[PDB]
Design a protein around this ligand. Structure first.
Ligand code: A1IQG
Ligand code: A1IQG
Lengths: 262, 259
């Protein structure tokens, strides 16, 4: 248990670090998607010709679906780096056993990537290149082989997750809660992780009540989204395994390679 | 928003109905498991054969040992489906939902509730059966042949973790209601009154846990995290059923009963 003044302090600390760690916030993403601006408008990629212009406008040689896939891997690697930097700011995290720090990151980064990818998404597509571009859901769904099925589950989650109307100050605490999960396989000291997560959960609960006072049981509704998050991470790895069987000419970043091994 | 007095009334209503619907409560099961008439113990092949003679099993039809135990699990699950169906009728609002939505919620909810309530009957060493007259050891179940041994052990693995929350029957009655009223089941026609009821049930669960476990910080949050897991475990479960129903190729009528 924490005094509410301490829970607010924790929320502000976490929101402050999130702003420092993640260059493209949900608030900026919404300003870009929601228009009414001329200085923030993205170039829209919806087909092969517009993709080819995007290389000139927004600014590898292989099949289109490969190039896009590789682009995502590059950005996922960046997200892992941003997420790693943020986790170190979570009070208590860097004091955990070093093996547990690694373990929490390995199983946590993908659930967080999907969570924050939703910020960049609406039902028609997703922001890319730090919001300079926007690639349509339709174009992603039409990519060949297994690559077309890759992107769409992300979109089905995002439309549902986005209906919660969370802002960055909410997401910063939620993301912290995800990292400090005591049920990750192979954890050596579950209890101090659970202790940190209890404080974070208290902070999330008070934050959601203050920031969405008319939004009954939003706390419980947000935690249920773990279900959706878990399900997509599993579909994602199962699709990766197919690609690792069909496209043996293709390599993953060492960081992603290590995250997925077991 | 609901007044706290209304939430307590809801909690009491659900507890009373849960007591009526389910033969073996968690409180009774714990009395048995903790040794506080000893149940007949099945720990190997010879005691299984005597337990079938001694206990009056209702599932013994004109097979291999691991099969017979599996069919026992099926027989009891079909029983639980009807007990859970009857309980749902008592959840305020449930019977006024669209009839297809009532069916849809039960169809996707019973498996999660069966796993949840199976934990009440389990400890790290085995499981109560036949309304607590029997006890089958975890070790004997874990050691069954082909995939059957790997079928039973996940139930125990979940139950040991779920039981560490130390919920009692009055907590579980509201929790079970929350699972049934899940507005994200596929094929639902009118989600809004379902989420509205679940919102009331969630409010009631939160107050129940705070009053009944005042020292158990964020237990509400921890229990909701367990609903999450249940989804993944049930999916692992059905996929295993599909394999057993495919690789271990009785009567077509029996096949229909257990569809
Ligand atoms: C050309 C081009 C297209 C889109 C982007 C934007 O992509 C992302 C941006 C961010 C961000 O800016 O924070 C964060 C995550 C992604 C993203 N990760 N991701 C995956 O899970 C993934 C991973 Cl981990 C490893 C290997 C392969 C994949 C992937 F094949 F599935 F892609 C996505 C899947 C679909 C979509 Cl639409 C986005 C992502 C940049 C450049
Ligand atoms: C010989 C013998 C052994 C044990 C029992 C007691 O079993 C149960 C009792 C109850 C109860 O009394 O509330 C409730 C569920 C089970 C039980 N279901 N079950 C399943 O696989 C299952 C589940 Cl989880 C959900 C849906 C459908 C099924 C099933 F159709 F596939 F069966 C088990 C697996 C292992 C164990 Cl150890 C117990 C169960 C009786 C007789």
């Amino acid at each position: 248990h924490m005094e509410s003044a301490d829970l607010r302090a924790l929320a502000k600390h976490l929101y402050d670090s999130y702003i420092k760690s993640f260059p493209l916030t949900k608030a900026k993403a919404r300003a870009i998607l929601t228009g009414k601006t001329t200085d923030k408008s993205p170039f829209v990629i919806y087909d092969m010709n517009s993709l080819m212009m995007g290389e000139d406008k927004i600014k590898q040689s292989k099949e289109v679906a490969i190039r896009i896939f590789q682009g995502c891997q590059f950005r996922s690697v960046e997200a892992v780096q941003e997420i790693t930097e943020y986790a170190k700011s979570i009070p208590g995290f860097v004091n955990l056993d070093l093996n547990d720090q690694v373990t929490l990151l390995k199983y946590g980064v993908h659930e967080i990537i999907y969570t924050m990818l939703a910020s960049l998404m609406n039902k028609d597509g997703v922001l890319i290149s730090e919001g300079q571009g926007f690639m349509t859901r339709e174009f992603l769904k039409s990519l060949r082989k297994p690559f077309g099925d890759f992107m769409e589950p992300k979109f089905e989650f995002a439309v549902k997750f986005n209906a919660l109307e969370l802002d960055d100050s909410d997401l910063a605490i939620f993301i912290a809660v995800i990292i400090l999960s005591g049920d990750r396989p192979g954890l050596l000291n579950v209890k101090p992780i659970e202790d940190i997560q209890d404080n974070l959960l208290q902070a999330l609960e008070l934050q959601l009540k203050l920031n969405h006072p008319e939004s009954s049981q939003l706390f419980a509704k947000l935690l249920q989204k773990m279900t959706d998050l878990r399900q997509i991470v599993t579909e994602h790895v199962q699709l990766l395994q197919v690609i690792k069987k069909t496209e043996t000419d293709m390599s993953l970043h060492p960081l992603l390679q290590e995250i997925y091994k077991d």
